[PDB]
Design a protein around this ligand. Structure first.
Ligand code: ZN
Ligand code: ZN
Ligand code: ZN
Ligand code: ZN
Ligand code: ZN
Ligand code: ZN
Lengths: 77, 77
């Protein structure tokens, strides 16, 4: 899909990878972020869950898919 | 975002790239496909447009983002 470009996580998920949903930070239900981005951000109180994904890419750093308050340390804007 | 995995176009768009919207094939308004995928498929009668994108990735081959009838020749399922 179309997205922001620049300062985004590129991470891509294979047949047996792990990601995180966060209902608090997502723009829509299929957004997700990779394990390092989830752990290097703050989703303490958030309505998150582990996903066992067969594909896609991390949305961290992309404000058209994820709230900037939920970006991790390494993907400012 | 989460997607299908396998037999998808990987293509990623930079600061001054071109993509195509196709309202007939898309699942939602921000889906898009790259120039080679659009040209190697059949969107003749379709409600398509050229996009001058600053980021994102091609959705061709990913049935969670694009209708399979709009996949190109090289991205069957
Ligand atoms: Zn990431
Ligand atoms: Zn990140
Ligand atoms: Zn969150
Ligand atoms: Zn493509
Ligand atoms: Zn294609
Ligand atoms: Zn089309």
């Amino acid at each position: 899909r179309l997205g922001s470009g620049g300062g985004v996580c590129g991470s891509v998920w294979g047949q047996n990878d792990i990601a995180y949903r966060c209902r608090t930070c997502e723009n829509d239900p299929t957004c997700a972020i990779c394990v390092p981005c989830f752990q290097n951000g703050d989703h303490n109180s958030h309505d998150y869950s582990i996903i066992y994904t067969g594909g896609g890419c991390c949305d961290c750093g992309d404000e058209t898919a994820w709230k900037p308050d939920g970006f991790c340390s390494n993907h400012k804007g």
